[PDB]
Design a protein around this ligand. Structure first.
Ligand SMILES: [Mg+2]
Ligand SMILES: [Zn+2]
Ligand SMILES: [Zn+2]
Ligand SMILES: [Zn+2]
Ligand SMILES: [Zn+2]
Lengths: 445, 608, 355, 66
């Protein structure tokens, strides 16, 4: 939902603020990268002719088989205020955002970029030895800090405050310690560009006027940037948060020349295997992977034995399972990790068993779990045996009369999100004590 | 530790477990061995070379903790090193081979452990001269220290037969263990028995390995041999007797086992039915030949409560006979207190132990070290499973959802009757009825195990097919057995703790457990071995079927987990089944209606 | 030391393919695969059982045969319980036989074989077949014996007289009567009674049987054949088809009698003349224009180039992996050699080199 | 015609009888038994009852493995 989250945020961004974002070619290039294929095709077609089109021509062009996907593309196109659809001459006359159009055109032609792709110094050096090494160092420090295994190099105070305020890896002030939230484990499960995008979305949400569009344009060009060169130190708000993301280890800055590491490239785009684990009914771990980070994250939910070159061995204990459970870490998160860490031989065996059971019966009279339930459902049985109850606390309305209070005001209560529970035949439904915003108002009628 | 080993931030739970301080050899690709010096464990790869040569060596000098298909967890023990030096092996050769095939530097503690676990091999020996336990040691150096020991009270002297067990335990304690390798070719004081290895008997490779490990010198090394179910332990004992050619006595813990091993022995060896005299309350005859055999179970020597004078004459005769060989088949019960009179009674030279399981509740299994000796050989269970020497089982553990109909009474029942109250669930009856239907639909012989006679008979009566338990007489149980085997009216039967072990019933490829013991792992393991010796263990596409109907919402899940954990560690996993197949497709279900459930509830309330 | 074994294995392999010939090979084919479904193929001895793998391999064989040679009709008769059962008439649509084989999947192989009955009704099915069509039968067999009603030698003589050849792919080992069939039908050749050694060898044998076979000089049938290219229409209205009698939006139109059909390469149902596309006839031109083998230059001698001419990659360096097209005097890598010799059917070095 | 202040709990007959044993060893916390899958309990003691229920299935299994 990364593109969904960013698109949602930009839809939250108003129309003229969006148009301000559509001014510069680097921002337009990054946003074009965000757009789905259909809308990407539409804008690359229309960008080289100043002919507005009606919707009817596009509809006649569009094959109706993917019409839902077309609707999604144009819904994003309109809701981002990237389109100006007006019903001119009775027809919904389709118009791209013109600033976006011309900035995309200049980016494609290599025309006027105003160094939106970057105020270049072009003093290239080696990046694998300084930039990549410092980047790996700083990211290792922040990563083990997020893990909770002890490490001396604490992060910045800005990100420390952002973690304190945010629900990510809770620095619980009563305990004085960063603590793994379920959101923290979601961040741990996240892909690296997902983690970066969540971090920048949270930082953009917390940061206020520091010009928001300056941060937006700078973020987009920073994603647009390339590795291993010096560049001019631009807006000053951009410069100071550039120093901030220098302290994050994103850029290797020599206090004016700065050298962006590979993290900008991964932020822009992604780039018996490694990370593939053989499950065991004896809960033994046969990982085809090793890192001290791997051991650090496996310490949270796996009882391990020793570290060898790719062979990380161990045995999953129920103590490890319940250690994961008691942190608020979801068993769905656990199986997210597990099903992202499967192995070729065992998944081939699972697919062979699935194709064997397909011909016998469609249901098979077996629980729906594709990963082999000899080991996988043992956690899933422990997953179901973990939660296994439903608790309702607070207020409760009871002993109703007839279903005019259910199909008219409790069926409507599904549309507004105020009930915690719904039982028509019991003539009772449960709400939270604090969730009495619009519950004791229309139920009286 | 061949390093500084500065403690890592991720080694906090690694309480001396982070084994990266070792300087891994670049030959880690070829070598298959790690060492875990924190607990003495050994980590072994199943996909690198030298493992085939090192497997028997690691069995000889080490014990396996866990052997799944990918990584074998072994462990060097002093027991295993004593077994190694008893087979004939030494500390320096063990250290040299370990460093030769080890990816990792050899640990100091392991080096010291193998140096300490080197015995005075050949120094301490005992012989029998006319039913007299003569402690014949090679030097008076042994005599000085043993007479320096306060228990005792070339050169040979007497120790009493009951004192032999105590002094063997004591000399093991002071780590001066005695080897018992009979020179049955050199000794002719005992009557030699003209029994020959018939050409009709040819020996399996692992069985030949088992023989030659205890026939390395040509003498009979005394100890234990642990082989799986149906491996041919009777053949191994027959071969040992035929190559010893002396008076031999073998005792097993069933009169049925007495019958079956007597016929097995007269079948596959050239000993004559005249030479074999069978001892029981059926008949107490003796053979008058100079050489031969008398078979009985352990009961007719242990018992003194109700004994006949003919039984007294027979036990007098076996006391008089100085045997050259003894085998205690199913050796798991002889170290019991009323059963460990074997050295006190029987004068026999070579002491061999053949059994399937080398585990029990207490530590009487280690007493066989100073009762019969160490383990001379073991066969790898999953190796024989893939070799077809034992079966391959698709075990399916059935988590029966507990009915509140029986749970409401089970929670308020007193403890002695809660067990019988939660065994008898109508939902379990329903599931068992469809499972029997489904496997007779598949065409499998089914044997049902219940720990209680009343539950066994109630299940049997609801099926309409008979029952066999421990109180059922031998004639009735064999009639029911032959009815099951041949008669098609008796398609399935209902067995118990006479069926869990010490029988030869391999036809039932399907087994459904409705009850078991509280925590005895050996009963469950022997029940698994009942079908592990099945005849169709070699055909392609075969998987035996094991079923355990266990009630939910109890401690029975933990009980079954405890009973199954040995088999899981062996490699016999227990898969999770809660939502069964065909629960309502079966039309008629046993005690399906709630009125029927309350009927059976008050029927069992009559007893509980 | 594995490379020396690979080299001598490649030498012993290439000794068979040293002689490459432009024999006249049959294009208007007539291929019959009879199936036995008896007690022998119930053996699970090969995984999962012989019946399942011959079903799967026959699916593949149908696909490959129709892809390579769409200018033939395919008939399948099963053998079961002392009876040979026709399940697939000869047809241009492979999908019919695919559905028939799918029916054969779920049914149970059982009984005993009768090559006499099987080959007799195969002969009768092969009876109304035009002269240019090359009547040939593949036979799979798993038994070591054959229960028969009468003589097989009269059938052998009749089959030889009616100019139909056979090729036997036996399962267990050689059967002397099948050897006799292959030899006598095949002008004394022993290159037709083939026994697999594993399932991979069976796959290779099926792929070998896919290929067209050369014809004999004495068996001379050199003539012409009437042909007609039709025309495809794409009409707005659905229209009744001649073959299946149902409404069709499009469909080719008959060049002669102006009727319409539903599939190609097919003969007309109305003017009764064969209709194809030039793609279909050019499909076998690699068989018509074979490709010479490419020679590795030795590692001792001086080299014209050190990287691959075609795929543009560096030649690896003990021996020299530079397969040379002597027709174009360019050396190539093993991957390009494989692709040009099997997948492609032209030498781009010879395309660049002007003649 | 009543609306008492309680915490509704989705339950089972078996765990409800365990709730009854909780009431037996200290009573008048659980208010009333609605049906086999519903109960009403004192809102001040909901997680006290939950932790004691945790102790109850601890006494059922405890998963020691030591
Ligand atoms: Mg019994
Ligand atoms: Zn048609
Ligand atoms: Zn026509
Ligand atoms: Zn190439
Ligand atoms: Zn060429």
């Amino acid at each position: 939902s990364l593109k969904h989250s960013v698109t949602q945020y930009l839809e939250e961004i108003p129309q003229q603020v969006q148009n301000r974002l559509y001014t510069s070619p680097a921002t337009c290039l990054a946003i074009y990268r965000i757009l789905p294929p259909l809308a990407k095709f539409f804008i690359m077609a229309m960008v080289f002719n100043e002919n507005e089109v009606p919707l009817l021509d596009l509809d006649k062009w569009v094959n109706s088989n993917g019409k839902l996907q077309f609707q999604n593309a144009i819904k994003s196109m309109k809701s981002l205020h990237l389109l100006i659809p007006n019903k001119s001459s009775g027809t919904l006359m389709i118009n791209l955002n013109p600033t976006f159009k011309i900035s995309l055109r200049n980016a494609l032609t290599g025309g006027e970029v105003q160094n939106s792709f970057g105020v270049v110094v072009e003093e290239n050096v080696v990046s694998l030895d300084l930039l990549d090494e410092y980047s790996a160092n700083k990211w290792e420090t922040i990563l083990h800090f997020m893990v909770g295994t002890p490490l001396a190099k604490i992060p910045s105070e800005k990100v420390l405050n952002l973690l304190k305020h945010s629900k990510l890896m809770e620095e619980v002030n009563s305990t004085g310690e960063f603590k793994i939230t379920n959101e923290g484990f979601q961040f741990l499960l996240q892909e690296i560009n997902s983690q970066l995008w969540t971090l920048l979305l949270q930082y953009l949400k917390m940061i206020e006027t520091m010009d928001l569009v300056d941060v937006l344009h700078f973020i987009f060009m920073l994603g647009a940037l390339e590795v291993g060169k010096a560049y001019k130190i631009l807006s000053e708000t951009q410069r100071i948060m550039l120093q901030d993301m220098r302290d994050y280890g994103l850029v290797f800055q020599k206090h004016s020349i700065f050298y962006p590491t590979k993290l900008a490239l991964m932020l822009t785009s992604d780039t018996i295997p490694d990370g593939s684990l053989i499950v065991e009914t004896n809960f033994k771990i046969y990982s085809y992977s090793n890192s001290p980070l791997q051991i650090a994250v496996l310490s949270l939910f796996v009882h391990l034995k020793a570290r060898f070159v790719n062979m990380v061995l161990g045995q999953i204990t129920r103590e490890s399972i319940r250690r994961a459970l008691t942190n608020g870490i979801t068993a769905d998160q656990i199986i997210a990790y597990l099903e992202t860490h499967a192995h070729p031989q065992m998944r081939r065996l699972a697919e062979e068993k699935l194709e064997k059971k397909l011909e016998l019966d469609p249901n098979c009279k077996e629980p729906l779990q594709v990963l082999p339930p000899t080991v996988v459902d043992q956690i899933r049985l422990w997953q179901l045996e973990l939660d296994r109850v439903i608790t309702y606390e607070g207020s409760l309305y009871s002993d109703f009369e007839t279903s005019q209070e259910y199909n008219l005001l409790s069926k409507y209560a599904q549309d507004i999100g105020v009930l915690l529970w719904k039982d028509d035949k019991k003539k009772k439904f449960f709400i939270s004590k604090e969730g009495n915003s619009q519950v004791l108002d229309f139920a009286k009628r | 530790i061949p390093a500084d080993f500065v403690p890592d931030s991720v080694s906090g739970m690694f309480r001396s477990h982070d084994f990266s301080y070792l300087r891994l050899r670049p030959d880690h690709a070829s070598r298959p061995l790690w060492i875990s010096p924190s607990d003495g464990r050994i980590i072994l790869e199943s996909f690198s070379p030298l493992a085939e040569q090192a497997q028997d060596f690691l069995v000889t000098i080490a014990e396996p903790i866990s052997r799944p298909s990918h990584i074998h967890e072994y462990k060097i023990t002093a027991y295993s090193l004593y077994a190694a030096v008893s087979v004939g092996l030494e500390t320096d050769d063990i250290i040299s081979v370990l460093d030769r095939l080890s990816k990792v530097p050899v640990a100091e503690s392991i080096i010291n452990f193998i140096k300490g676990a080197t015995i005075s091999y050949g120094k301490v020996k005992l012989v029998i001269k006319h039913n007299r336990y003569f402690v014949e040691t090679t030097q008076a150096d042994i005599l000085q220290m043993l007479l320096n020991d306060s228990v005792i009270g070339v050169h040979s002297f007497e120790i009493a037969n009951e004192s032999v067990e105590v002094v063997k335990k004591r000399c093991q304690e002071i780590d001066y263990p005695v080897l018992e390798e009979y020179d049955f070719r050199n000794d002719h004081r005992n009557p030699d028995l003209d029994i020959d290895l018939k050409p009709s008997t040819q020996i399996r490779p692992y069985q030949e390995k088992s023989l030659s490990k205890m026939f390395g010198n040509g003498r009979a090394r005394s100890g234990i041999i642990v082989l799986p179910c149906g491996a041919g332990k009777t053949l191994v004992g027959i071969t040992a007797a035929c190559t010893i050619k002396k008076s031999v006595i073998v005792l097993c813990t069933s009169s049925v086992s007495v019958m079956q091993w007597r016929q097995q022995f007269l079948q596959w060896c050239t000993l004559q039915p005249e030479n074999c005299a069978v001892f029981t309350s059926d008949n107490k005859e003796m053979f008058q030949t100079e050489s031969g055999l008398v078979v009985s179970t352990y009961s007719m020597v242990a018992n003194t409560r109700n004994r006949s004078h003919d039984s007294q004459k027979v036990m007098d005769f076996l006391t008089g006979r100085e045997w050259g060989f003894i085998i205690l088949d199913e050796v798991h019960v002889v170290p019991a207190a009323m059963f460990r009179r074997v050295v006190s009674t029987i004068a026999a030279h070579a002491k061999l132990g053949l059994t399937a399981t080398l585990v029990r509740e207490d530590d009487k299994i280690g007493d066989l070290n100073f009762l019969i000796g160490p383990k001379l050989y073991e066969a790898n269970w999953m190796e024989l499973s893939q070799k077809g020497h034992i079966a391959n089982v698709q075990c399916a553990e059935v988590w029966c959802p507990m009915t509140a109909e029986f749970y409401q009474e089970y929670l308020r029942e007193t403890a002695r009757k809660r067990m019988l109250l939660y065994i008898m669930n109508p939902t379990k009856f329903q599931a068992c009825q469809f499972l029997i239907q489904y496997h007779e639909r598949r065409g499998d012989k089914i044997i049902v195990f219940s720990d209680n006679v009343y539950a066994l008979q109630e299940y049997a009566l609801k099926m309409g097919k008979p029952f066999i338990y421990g109180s059922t007489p031998q004639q009735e149980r064999m009639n029911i057995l032959q009815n099951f085997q041949y008669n098609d009216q008796i398609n399935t039967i209902f067995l118990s703790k006479v069926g869990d072990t010490s029988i030869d019933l391999p036809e039932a490829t399907c087994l459904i457990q409705i009850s078991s013991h509280y925590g005895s792992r050996r009963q469950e393991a022997q029940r698994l071995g009942r079908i592990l010796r099945a005849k169709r263990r070699n055909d392609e596409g075969f998987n035996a079927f094991f079923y355990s109907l266990v009630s939910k919402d109890t401690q029975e899940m933990y009980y079954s987990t405890k009973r199954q954990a040995f088999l899981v560690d062996q490699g016999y996993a227990f898969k999770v089944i809660t939502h069964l197949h065909g629960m309502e497709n079966i039309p008629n279900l046993a005690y399906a209606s709630p009125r029927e459930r309350r009927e059976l509830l008050q029927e069992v309330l009559l007893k509980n | 030391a594995s490379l020396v074994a690979s080299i001598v294995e490649a030498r012993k392999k290439r000794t068979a393919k040293k002689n490459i010939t432009p024999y006249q090979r049959g294009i208007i084919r007539s291929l019959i695969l009879t199936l036995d479904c008896s007690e022998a193929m119930l053996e699970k001895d090969l995984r999962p059982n012989r019946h399942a793998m011959i079903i799967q391999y026959a699916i593949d064989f149908v696909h490959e045969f129709f892809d390579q040679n769409p200018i033939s009709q395919m008939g399948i008769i099963i053998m079961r319980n002392g009876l040979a059962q026709l399940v697939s008439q000869v047809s241009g649509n492979p999908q019919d036989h695919i559905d028939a084989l799918k029916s054969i999947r779920k049914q149970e192989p059982k009984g005993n074989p009768s090559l006499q009955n099987a080959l007799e009704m195969a002969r009768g099915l092969l009876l109304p077949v035009p002269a240019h069509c090359t009547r040939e039968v593949l036979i799979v067999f798993g038994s070591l014996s054959t229960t028969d009603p009468g003589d097989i030698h009269q059938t052998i003589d009749s089959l030889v007289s009616e100019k139909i050849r056979v090729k036997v792919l036996g399962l267990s080992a050689q059967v002397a009567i099948c050897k006799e069939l292959c030899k006598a039908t095949n002008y004394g050749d022993e290159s037709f009674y083939k026994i697999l050694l594993d399932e991979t060898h069976l796959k290779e044998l099926f792929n070998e049987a896919v290929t067209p076979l050369p014809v004999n000089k004495i068996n001379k049938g050199f003539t012409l054949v009437k042909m007609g290219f039709p025309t495809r229409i794409f009409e707005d209205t659905p229209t009744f088809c001649s073959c299946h009698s149902k409404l069709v939006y499009g469909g080719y139109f008959c060049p002669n009698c102006h009727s319409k059909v539903c599939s190609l390469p097919t003969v007309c149902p109305c003017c009764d003349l064969m209709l194809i596309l030039s793609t279909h006839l050019a499909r076998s031109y690699h068989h018509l224009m074979p490709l010479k083998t490419f020679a590795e230059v030795p590692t001792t001698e001086k080299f014209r180039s050190e990287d691959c001419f075609s795929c543009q990659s560096r030649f690896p360096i003990l021996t020299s992996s530079r397969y040379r097209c002597e027709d174009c005097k360019q050396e190539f890598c093993v991957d390009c050699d494989v692709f040009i010799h099997e997948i492609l059917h032209n030498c781009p070095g010879c395309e660049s080199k002007p003649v | 015609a009543r609306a008492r202040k309680g915490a509704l709990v989705q339950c089972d007959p078996s765990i409800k009888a365990l709730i009854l044993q909780i009431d037996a060893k200290m009573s008048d916390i659980v208010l009333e038994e609605l049906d086999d899958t519903h109960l009403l309990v004192n809102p001040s003691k909901v997680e006290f009852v939950k932790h004691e229920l945790n102790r109850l299935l601890s006494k059922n299994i405890y998963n020691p493995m030591d």
